[PDB]
Amino acid sequence: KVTVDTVCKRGFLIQMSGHLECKCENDLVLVNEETCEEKVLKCDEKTVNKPCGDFSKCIKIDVSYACKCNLGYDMVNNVCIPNECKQVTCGNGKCILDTSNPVKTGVCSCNIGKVPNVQDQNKCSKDGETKCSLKCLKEQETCKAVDGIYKCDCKDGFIISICT
Amino acid sequence: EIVLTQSPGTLSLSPGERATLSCRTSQSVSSSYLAWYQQKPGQAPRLLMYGASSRATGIPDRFSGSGSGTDFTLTISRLEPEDFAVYYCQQYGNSFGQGTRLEIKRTVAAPSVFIFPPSDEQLKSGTASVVCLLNNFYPREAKVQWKVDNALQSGNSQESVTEQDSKDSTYSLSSTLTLSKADYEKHKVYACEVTHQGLSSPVTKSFNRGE
Amino acid sequence: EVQLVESGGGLVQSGGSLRLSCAASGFTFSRNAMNWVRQAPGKGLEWVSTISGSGDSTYYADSVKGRFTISRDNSKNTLYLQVNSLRAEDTAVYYCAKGDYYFDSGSYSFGMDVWGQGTTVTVSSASTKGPSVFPLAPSTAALGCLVKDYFPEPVTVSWNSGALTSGVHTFPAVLQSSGLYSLSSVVTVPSSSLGTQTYICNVNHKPSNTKVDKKVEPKS
């Protein structure tokens, strides 16, 4: 489970209305919830068990090789989506899996400013303040709201490896 | 499967008082997955708290839920007559609690005891039933013993207690002594002895075959 | 609005099979986990089983594993409960419930917010029998009626076809050793009412379409 103390390997933290996750750098893909590696372009015998996409690795078929999503993920337009999130719409946000839930359940996590509206099938339509919990401890970095999600970025005066 | 223990078993309070209901799990659970439910006699259960503290829609603000780890408490302050019911806690996707029952607390009232001989329409059949009526008493705790020719009975009686009255908050008990026509005509005097807090001495309502 | 309507109950011999269903309407059925909750007569709530929104994840209580089976058809917005080899302890009112959440102050808090009316299942080898009514002759006096040996539940008891609701007590039924139910219903009236006002009790038993109107009068 991703927290504010998570170190995204070759990635960075972002915050939505109800969860945190790691976004990868450039064209990297998520090998786990907190690690980004390079996606292999074509699976073969040498790239066995190597990441080929977000939450997907290379598998061997007894002889061919394909890119399959991890257990519990469904492929929707070549990206792996959690199973219980296939039939779940959220609008101003995305569907995420509730890790701690005893039963497999999909919940809506909203862009900053919205909360799940219990009077609208818990879709993202009710206005709600989401306080930024990100700890931007880099040089001259702070929590800015960029494109509906919280992230760490340079302050009012500094810009671009270290903010200046 | 965890084990949820609710306390107390029966909570007797007066309207306007504060009610504290406990739910203790055998293990530790996230507060987001332990809900509270209310059920009226004859009705479907109704959700009270999403998780441990989030009031469901339509639930009055006097209901308050708190808890962490293994201890969870539902707090109902300024009790109203519509609040007295049975309350359950449940781990989401797991078992319920045994349930805590909320009963209105009122003045101690003695039961008016009535005994009913078996009717002639029933005596035509092979069985007879003599009914003992304990009407409008509080609290519900009461003892009934049948005595045919001054002899205690067992295995031949059944008891039912109505819900708490919505008017005077009293209880009523019905005890039926089922005996065959042969054993009924064999004896003479039948009585049910009643013991209750509102009676200084146990009251006996008797009758003889032929009134 | 959101609606859950259950069906599939009824009487069934010991060891028989049953298929309960729960028709949902008013919401996207596939996005919410569903639940079965039963309650035996005079007992408390007992969680039976839970199924995920897609149906790929199912959960069962230890008391129902092996016999019970939960499933759902999202094309019809229907939840099911398949049972085989029913035990006598299965006699209960079976509710369905919608499992949803409420995002309140940083946390997704879950619960069963929408419930159905419940369908009653009855496992017994007893046959449907009409009730037999007997008077309870009074000696404020008290008189009543004895609804004896009927099956199955329930019986509706009124007095004077309504208009006599003050001081009436229809006690809960007891399951006699023969497997047949029996309850009493009494009403208290002042002693200055006997002999001048007629008192009848209306015992309507739908499972046999039997309605008996036995009048009670003082003995002689």
Which position has the token pair 């009514």?
A: C133
Whether A31 maps to a domain, the answer reads: yes
Nearest to C107 by CA among A14, B32, A115: B32
Q: Which helix (H) or strand (E) holds B184?
A: helix B181-186
Residue C76 main-chain phi, psi, to 5 deg: -110, 0
CB contacts of B161 in chain C (<8 Å) are: 171-172
Contact A100 B92 (CB under 8 A): no
Q: Tell me phi and psi for residue C202, to 5 degrees.
A: -105, 105
Instruction: Tell whether B79 and B154 lie within a shared domain.
Output: no
Other beta carbons less than 10 A from residue A123's beta carbon: 21
DSSP state, residue A91: B
**Are the beta carbons of B3 and B56 closer than 8 angstroms?**
no
Rounded Cα distance, A44 and A66, in Å = 8
The topology under which CATH files domain C126-218 is Immunoglobulin-like (2.60.40)
B90 CB-near residues (< 8 Å, 6+ apart): B4, B34, B35, B37, B96, B97, C45, C47, C112
Token readout for B197 is: 């807090």
Name the one residue in this structure whose structure tokens are 């037999």: C132
The position carrying tokens 């408490």 is B73
Nearest to B94 among A102, A118, A119 (CB): A102
Experimental technique used to determine this entry: X-ray
The answer on B19 and B50 residing in a single domain is: yes
**Residues B23 and B85 sit within 8 Å (Cβ to Cβ):** no
Give CA torsion, residues B101, B105, B111, B117, to 10 deg: -20
- Within an 8 Å CB–CB cutoff, is residue A61 touching chain B? no
CA distance B85 to B151: 39
The answer to whether B190 and B207 are in contact (CB under 8 A) is: yes
The residue with tokens 């003992």 is: B132
Residue where the block lists tokens 């619960």: C111
DSSP state of A153: E
Helix or strand (DSSP H, E) at C56 = none
Torsion of CA C53, C55, C57, C60, to 10 degrees: 100
Domain boundary among B82, B106, B130: B106
Q: Give CA–CA dist C69/C36, Å, rounded.
A: 11
Q: Which residues of A5-44 are buried (b: 16+ CB within 10 A; e: fewer)?
A: eeebeebbbbbbbbbbbbebeeebbbbeebbbeebbeebe
Identity of the residue numbered C59: Y
* C110 contact residues in A (CB cutoff 8 A): 101, 105
**Nearest residue to A26 (alpha-carbon basis) of A34, A37, A42:** A37
Q: Scanning the structure block, which residue is given the tokens 């269903």? A: C21
Same domain, B66 and B155: no
B129 with B178, same domain: the answer is yes
* B210 and B123 part of one domain: yes
* Straight-line distance from the first to the last Cα atom of chain C, in angstroms, rounded to the nearest whole number: 60
In angstroms, rounded to a whole number, what is the distance separating the alpha carbons of residues B196 and B100? 24
Distance between CA B109 and CA B143 in Å, rounded?
15
Tell me how crowded residue A79 is: count the other CB atoms within 10 A of its CB.
Answer: 14
Q: Do B93 and A102 touch (CB under 8 A)?
A: yes
Q: Is the peptide bond before B8 cis (omega within 30 degrees of 0)?
A: yes
Specify whether the CB–CB gap between A154 and A163 falls below 8 A: yes
A147: in domain: yes
Is C169 in CB contact (< 8 Å) with chain B?
yes
Check B90 against C47: CB less than 8 A apart: yes
What DSSP assignment string belongs to C19-57?
EEEEEEESS-GGGSEEEEEEE-TTS--EEEEEE-SSSS-
Q: Tokens for C71?
A: 């499933």
* Cα–Cα distances in angstroms (integers) from residue B23 to residues B66, B100, C171, C201, in the given order: 10, 9, 31, 44
Identify the burial level of C176 via C-beta atoms within 10 angstroms of its C-beta, where 0-12 means exposed, 13-18 middle and 19 or more buried: middle
Pairing of strands A56-61, A64-69: antiparallel
Q: What is the largest CA-CA distance in chain C?
A: 75
In a domain, A3, yes or no: no
CATH of the domain at A72: 2.90.20.10
Non-local (6+) Cβ contacts of B200 within 8 A are: none
A104: containing domain: 8-164
* 8 Å CB contact between B162 and B137: no
Total count of domains within chain A: 1
Has residue A65 been placed in a domain?
A: yes
Q: Which of the listed residues B46, B75, B106 is the one where a domain comes to its end?
A: B106
Same-domain status, B112 and B198: yes
How distant, in Å, are the alpha carbons of A57, A67, C105, C148 from that of B34? 37, 40, 16, 43
CB contacts, 8 Å: B129 with chain C: 134, 146, 148
* B202 and B120 co-located in one domain: yes
- Chain B hits for A102, CB-CB cut-off 8 Å, are 33, 91-94
Q: Output the six-digit token pair for C216.
A: 């009670």
Nearest-by-Cβ selection for A103 from C59, C74, C108: C59
Domain extent, residue B53, equals: 1-106
Q: Which of residues 62-81 of B touch C (CB under 8 A)?
A: none
Q: Which long-range contacts (CB under 8 A, 24 or more apart) does A147-153 make?
A: A148/A92, A148/A111, A148/A112, A148/A113, A149/A14, A149/A15, A149/A16, A149/A111, A149/A112, A150/A14, A150/A15, A150/A16, A150/A112, A151/A12, A151/A13, A151/A14, A151/A15, A152/A12, A152/A13
C-alpha to C-alpha distance for A11 and A26, rounded to whole angstroms:
9
Q: How many domains does chain B have?
A: 2
Would you state the structure tokens that stand for residue B155, as one six-digit string?
């295995």
What is the dihedral sign for C-alpha C164, C165, C169, C172?
positive
Q: Where are the domains of chain C?
A: 1-125, 126-218
Q: How many CA atoms lie within 13 A of A67 on its CB side?
A: 18
Q: Looking at the domain assignment, is residue A20 inside a domain?
A: yes
How many Cβ atoms are within 10 Å of C195's Cβ, its own excluded?
A: 9
The answer to whether A27 and A33 are in contact (CB under 8 A) is: no
Chain centroid offset of residue A43 CA: 24
Give the residues after which the backbone of chain A is interrupted, taking a C-to-next-N distance over 2.5 angstroms as a break: 62, 160
Looking up tokens 């337009």 gives A77
Kind of pairing between the strands at B10-13 and B100-104:
parallel
The breaks in chain C (C to N more than 2.5 Å) occur after: 139
Question: Token pair of B104, please?
Answer: 């209105």
Task: Please report the resolution in angstroms.
Answer: 2.5
Residue A1, min C-alpha distance to chain B (Å): 15
Dihedral angle at the C-alpha atoms of B175, B179, B185, B191, nearest 10 degrees? Answer: -20
Considering Cα of B6, then B7, then B9, then B12, what sign does the dihedral take? negative
Q: For residue C199, what are the CA distances in angstroms to B120, B130, C92, C136, C148?
A: 18, 20, 35, 11, 19
Å from A72 to nearest chain B CA?
Answer: 19
Alpha-carbon span C158 to C177, nearest angstrom:
26
B96: domain CATH number is: 2.60.40.10
Mutate to test the interface with A, among C36, C54, C100, C104 (most CBs of A within 10 A): C54
CA B114, B120, B122 angle in degrees (round to 5)?
90
Do B74 and B62 contact (CB within 8 A), yes or no? no
Contacts of B102 (CB under 8 A, 6+ apart): B11, B13, B19, B21, B76, B79, B83, B84, B85, B86, B87
Question: Does residue B114 sit in the same domain as residue B96?
Answer: no
Give one DSSP letter per residue of B55-106, joined into a string: EPTT--TTEEEEEETTEEEEEE-S--GGG-SEEEEEETTSPBB--EEEEE--
Look at residues B54, B86, B106 and tell me which one is the last residue of a structural domain: B106
Interchain contact, B30 vs A103, CB within 8 Å = no
List the structure tokens of C18: 């049953």
d(CA B121, CA B140): 32
| Beta-strand relationship, A106-110 and C92-104 | unpaired
A121 touches chain B (CB under 8 A): no
Residue A96: strand, helix, or coil: strand
Are B8 and B82 in a shared domain?
A: yes
User: Is A2 inside a domain boundary?
Assistant: no
* Both tokens assigned to C112: 């069963």
